[PDB]
């Protein structure tokens, strides 16, 4: 609970925010599925009320957002949006910020890697069952990563290396396998030793780190796709001191 | 790439799947579907070592208006008098069993393409590597099954970009050498401690990728003997 994890609290709401003004806009009912999922999922781990009451305001918030006004602007949604979420005991959705960038993206990437790891790390004797379906809906919530922003370079990119944080979410979920069926999980502190494990060893942490070091790797391909030569990359000590973990 | 008899293996599953790809010209659906499919069988073909590129081509076209009525059968027999008379016996497998082994085979055996090729880039072919390995990424993005998985083939659409990931650290690797050279190391914890990169990093990759997918079978099931590193080295002579 730091300044950092502040920014990204309010990035996160910036997000579902963006998404859900999508949903009038949709031109196949596909997309028009994928959003509101999407958005539903990402408002369940978002803590807005005391989740018997919050999952069902937000269905009411998501039914407006498809219904609502597809010639309205992005302003006069933004407008009716905060109505409705006053109305609705909802002022917690509320963004504070409205500034739209990368950061906010990658903000609500970082946020979902830091929710995973405290449900893991906290999991206990009978939530377990409980862990490992909050890990399907991380998985499928890293798969359809919206951007809004235009940027088809972006999206080309992440379709292509998303995998990588996806797999980690795998792991994770096989370690809570194991440690159903009897092999507890040991938390170790750093990546290379639940590297060696290659027996029930993982990371505290980790998709705190997974998600720092692929956006590193992002950072790092962008001088191959515009042909330059790079320059302070954000590093794992620093980044712990920043999110006090 | 040191001969063995699992890489012997390899080379012969490489060739069945590459068969395998295209005999699907012919019953492509749309053409989107058609030109994937094309495009893949060539750059698998570029990899094989058989003019050559010009008699794929050929082949290529020859397999795009073979005719949909086929069964695989006669297929197979049309294209082994095909490629007997374009000069290409050695694109034709010794053996036709297709299985989940053939498809891991080719996929090690890409895997064995990339550090081979990487190793013994020189500074003059620098560009040249670059190159492939993004031929390399597409056809890791492009895996087709062939077989009926339809499990499989979700689970591979999720998590593939970890082998595309680490392909993306070798081309950050020679573009730093293209300005600081490589350090080759042995073992991943090495290069994962810190411009370093694993000696055999992508057979180490497929070979770990594999084991993941094992390993993750039994959640998929509700349900022993794993590789490792050290004995696939040695069954491979790394
Ligand atoms: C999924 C995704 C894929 C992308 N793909 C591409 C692409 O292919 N090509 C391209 O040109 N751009 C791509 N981008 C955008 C790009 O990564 C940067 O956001 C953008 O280039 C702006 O650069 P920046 O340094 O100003 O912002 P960034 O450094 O990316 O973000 C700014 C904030 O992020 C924090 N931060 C910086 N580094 C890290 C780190 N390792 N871990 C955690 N926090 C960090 C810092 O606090 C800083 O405040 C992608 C972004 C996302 C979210
Ligand atoms: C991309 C891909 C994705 C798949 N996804 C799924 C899935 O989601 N769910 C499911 O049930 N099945 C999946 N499969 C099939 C599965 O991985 C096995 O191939 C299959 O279940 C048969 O198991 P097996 O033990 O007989 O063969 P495998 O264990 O897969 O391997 C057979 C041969 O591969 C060699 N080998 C074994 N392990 C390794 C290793 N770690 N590294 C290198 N070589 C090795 C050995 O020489 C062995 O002869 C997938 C296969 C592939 C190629």
Known sequence: ???????????????????????????????????????????????????????????????????????????????????????????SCQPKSFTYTFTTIWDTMHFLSLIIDDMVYTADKSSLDFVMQQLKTMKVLFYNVFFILQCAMCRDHYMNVKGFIIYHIELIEIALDKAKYGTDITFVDSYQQETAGANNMLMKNLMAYVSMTFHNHINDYKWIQRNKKPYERMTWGEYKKLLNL
């Not at 949709?26 to 999407?38: A, E, V, Y």
């Not at 978002?46 to 919050?54: E, N, P, S």
């Not at 918030?61 to 949604?77: K, R």
Request: a positive charge; hydrophobic letters at 40%.
């Open 1 to 91: 609970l730091t300044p950092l994890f502040s920014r990204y609290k309010d990035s996160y709401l910036l997000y579902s925010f963006r998404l859900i003004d999508l949903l009038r806009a949709s031109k196949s009912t596909h997309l028009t599925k994928l959003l509101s999922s999407q958005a539903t999922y990402l408002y369940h781990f978002a803590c807005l009320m005391y989740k018997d009451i919050q999952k069902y305001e937000v269905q009411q918030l998501i039914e407006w957002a498809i219904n609502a006004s597809p010639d309205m602007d992005l302003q006069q949604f933004r407008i009716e949006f905060m109505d409705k979420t006053t109305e609705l005991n909802l002022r």
